[PDB]
């Protein structure tokens, strides 16, 4: 019976491959062949944020495109005013081992998590004037690798126990569990409508999950190593994954297979973070070679390099209005680029 | 100045946050970072109990005006290479292994836990992140190994062992096998201590090893090393 189930599974996988091949007549390199190239992209460092003393592991911008939050291994979650480099807040974390942080769309709450397997939500707007631990979510048996706010009360997180989770914050209970990944889920991205979300794990696969239904929609397998980053296209009909095989890959949800590959022979190091520009034409990816490349998402040709960090670029984000791109590295510095 | 009154007050608040961060960093930099590692039932529990007497578990204690933090990853059931780099820069790595494991095969199967501990030690010591971090090797359960070696010879673990079935010689052999797994002979040093269930010199040995590491790091900083 087990062998019959395995042969049914492999027949189904072959059917998936055949169906994907059938709906593949012209590549993205052929559709976007006569379009004008983006050209050389010159982005300069406008602000440098100092105050972190250990390697910085994550950051998130926020909807207002002015504030930002950064988490560092020195046990500090610092909320910066990017326009004036002022430190709006400095939260001392209970556990110094933080690897992810999220800033709520409303801005009233901020999230973090890490090796303590607990997602801590802090209330920034308190009548006491300080920042207090609003809630601690527990239940993941592995390290918390990513977290993203749906709203003030719902949060989606990914953990190293091959599991994603949707939590109701006021109750503190794990509302929904997303399972199916066979490797540690390293990053997740939320769709613009906050109805679906993609999660990339260490099994070299990405999965699309329906938030409301709680079940996986599609699985995309094009990478050859652990996927460290993921990010939707601005229209929510495609996404990009960076992995350890020194390649980025643009997949799309509605055709259900890979569209484009972003790789160069002179790059051997893996990708730590990716994000899309406001129009989606530029894909920014941070690498382990201390640099940050900017690729043409439509032509796959590299457009620029953001080389200003002295250590591994660990986190990278783009504002909602797209005005600037912020990169934080292991040298305890964030840099804003325009 | 073009700043408003509220802007100047915000800048003053930022400067206060800056000096508080500097004070916190000064306090934290005066503290020893120890990463506790080992196989299953290696003896990490008795080690942390001894240090207390004199996700991730943090153990803070004091000895000779030094503050020590041990980070026992322990029950972190995830493949290690995605978060081991978080521990790069620790003062030392305390690697605990049980001697009596030399003839025990229930690893999870049909292979010695001793060899699994050897492979874990090889992975940690020769890791790309811990090229200069020093290892403090703890060989626990010496008292029970004393009586176990008299019935099951060491050849159950090492087929090439030819020495006498004596505690000192076989223990030296095991220490030599662990030290040979070090490929960074020039950048890092391995400190070995032979501990038991009822000894109180373990914290003194950790103090000595940390002091030696501090001296070596200072010599590197001065350029004299």
């Amino acid at each position: 019976e087990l062998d019959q189930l395995r042969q049914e599974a492999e027949q189904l996988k072959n059917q998936i491959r055949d169906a994907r091949k059938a709906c593949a007549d012209a590549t993205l390199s052929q559709i976007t062949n006569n379009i004008d190239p983006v050209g050389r992209i010159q982005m300069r460092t406008r602000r440098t944020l100092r105050g972190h003393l250990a390697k910085i592991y994550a950051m998130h911008w926020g909807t207002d495109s002015r504030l930002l939050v950064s988490a560092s291994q020195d046990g500090k979650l610092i909320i910066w005013d990017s326009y004036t480099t002022n430190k709006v807040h400095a939260i001392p974390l209970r556990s110094s081992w933080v690897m992810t942080c999220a800033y709520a769309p409303s801005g009233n709450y901020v999230a973090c998590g890490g090796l303590d397997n607990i997602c801590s939500i802090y209330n920034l707007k308190t009548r006491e004037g300080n920042v207090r631990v609003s809630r601690e979510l527990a239940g993941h048996t592995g390290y918390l690798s990513c977290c993203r706010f749906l709203d003030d009360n719902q949060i989606v997180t990914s953990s190293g126990d091959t599991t994603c989770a949707l939590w109701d914050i006021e109750t503190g209970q794990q509302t929904t569990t997303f399972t199916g990944h066979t490797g540690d889920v390293m990053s997740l991205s939320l769709a613009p409508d906050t109805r679906l979300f993609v999660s990339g794990a260490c099994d070299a696969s990405a999965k699309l999950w329906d938030v409301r239904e709680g079940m996986c929609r599609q699985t995309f397998t094009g990478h050859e190593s652990d996927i460290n980053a993921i990010c939707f296209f601005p229209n929510g009909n495609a996404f990009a994954t960076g992995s350890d095989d020194a390649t980025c890959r643009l997949f799309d949800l509605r055709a259900d297979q890979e569209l484009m590959t972003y790789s160069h022979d002179n790059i051997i190091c893996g990708i730590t973070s990716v994000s899309f520009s406001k129009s989606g034409r530029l894909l920014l990816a941070g690498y382990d070679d201390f640099n940050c490349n900017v690729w043409d998402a439509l032509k796959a040709d590299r457009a620029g390099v953001l080389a200003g960090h002295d250590n591994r670029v660990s986190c990278l984000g783009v504002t909602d209005d797209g005005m600037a791109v912020a990169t934080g590295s292991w040298d305890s510095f964030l840099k804003i680029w325009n | 100045c073009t700043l408003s009154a509220e802007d100047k007050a915000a800048v003053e608040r930022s400067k206060m946050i800056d000096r508080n961060l500097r004070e916190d960093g000064e306090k934290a930099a005066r503290e020893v970072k120890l990463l506790l590692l080992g196989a299953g039932e290696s003896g990490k529990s008795t080690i942390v109990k001894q240090m207390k007497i004199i996700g991730i578990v943090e153990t803070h204690f004091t000895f000779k005006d030094l503050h020590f933090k041990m980070f026992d990853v322990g029950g972190q059931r995830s493949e290690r290479k995605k978060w081991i780099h978080c521990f790069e820069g620790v003062t030392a790595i305390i690697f605990c292994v049980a001697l009596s494991d030399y003839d025990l095969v229930l690893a999870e199967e049909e292979m010695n836990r001793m060899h699994e501990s050897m492979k874990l030690f090889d992975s940690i010591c020769n890791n790309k992140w811990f090229t200069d971090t020093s290892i403090i090797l703890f060989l626990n359960k010496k008292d029970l190994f004393e009586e176990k070696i008299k019935k099951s010879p060491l050849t159950i673990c090492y087929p090439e062992y030819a020495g006498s079935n004596t505690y000192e010689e076989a223990a030296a052999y095991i220490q030599c096998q662990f030290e040979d797994l070090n490929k960074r002979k020039d950048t890092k040093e391995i400190y070995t201590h032979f501990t038991c269930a009822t000894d109180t010199k373990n914290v003194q040995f950790v103090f000595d090893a940390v002091t030696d590491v501090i001296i070596k790091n200072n010599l590197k900083d001065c350029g004299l090393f």
Partner: single-chain antibody, 235 residues
Framework: DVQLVESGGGLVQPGGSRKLSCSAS????????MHWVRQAPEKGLEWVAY????????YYADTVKGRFTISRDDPKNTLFLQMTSLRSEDTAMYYC??????????????WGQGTTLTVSSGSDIVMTQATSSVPVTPGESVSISCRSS???????????LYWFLQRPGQSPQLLIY???NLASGVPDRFSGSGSGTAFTLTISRLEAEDVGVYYC?????????FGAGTKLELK
């Protein structure tokens, strides 16, 4: 909740000295700047003194500079005002006001109950509230106007205008900060608008508890000045 108590007021002979203590509870006193504000018996508010968090910066009004000294003891969460050479014009209700300053913050958030002091017997922005009082009817719409001698709009785009309401027998309560934002706990009936040197505060479907004196404050140039106030009365 957060609460401030002022103590140390009473009958004082002219030229004497007096000590006022404001005790704070329910909030992080060390991280809040503190203001001493004065209201004469039949007059409006008048900013007196300010001490920042950590006592880094200290400011006084010109009428009280030199004689008055503002200080704070953070471990005891208390604020001190030492007054020397008291004049007959210093008799008033004194309020200690908490005020935190960061991006998006709401300064002058909470006001103390105030303590009564009874002394026995230029180049600053003038904020003008031309109308002394208006009669209103519950359920109607009323607009309170304000005018400034100098434009309150800064190069950063913020218009530093603050609106306060002082119900009879109670301390002033913040309604609008920076001319647009609504303070926490304030009903959405109050709306703040204006531009440059002209400002207005509009109340939609005013209720019975909206009766009081509305004060207009500026925060651009630091010698804070208040408006004369506009009293609302029922018919």
């Amino acid at each position: 909740d957060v609460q401030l108590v002022e103590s140390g007021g009473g009958l004082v002979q002219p030229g004497g000295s007096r000590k006022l203590s404001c005790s704070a509870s329910g909030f992080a006193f060390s991280s809040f700047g503190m203001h001493w504000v004065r209201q004469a018996p039949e007059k409006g508010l008048e900013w007196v003194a300010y001490i920042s968090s950590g006592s880094g910066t200290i400011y006084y009004a010109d009428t009280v500079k030199g004689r008055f000294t503002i200080s704070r003891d953070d471990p005891k969460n208390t604020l001190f005002l030492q007054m020397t050479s008291l004049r007959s014009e210093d008799t008033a209700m004194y309020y200690c006001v908490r005020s935190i300053y960061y991006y998006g913050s709401s300064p002058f958030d909470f006001w103390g109950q105030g303590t009564t002091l009874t002394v026995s017997s230029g180049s600053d922005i003038v904020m003008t509230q031309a109308t002394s009082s208006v009669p209103v009817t519950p359920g109607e719409s009323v607009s309170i106007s304000c005018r400034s001698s100098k434009s309150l709009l800064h190069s950063n785009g913020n218009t530093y205008l603050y609106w306060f309401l002082q119900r009879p027998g109670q301390s002033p309560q913040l309604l609008i900060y920076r001319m647009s934002n609504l303070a926490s706990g304030v009903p959405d009936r109050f709306s703040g608008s204006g531009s440059g040197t002209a400002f207005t505060l509009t109340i939609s479907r005013l209720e019975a508890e909206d009766v009081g004196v509305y004060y207009c404050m500026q925060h651009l140039e630091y010698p804070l000045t208040f408006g004369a106030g506009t009293k609302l009365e029922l018919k």
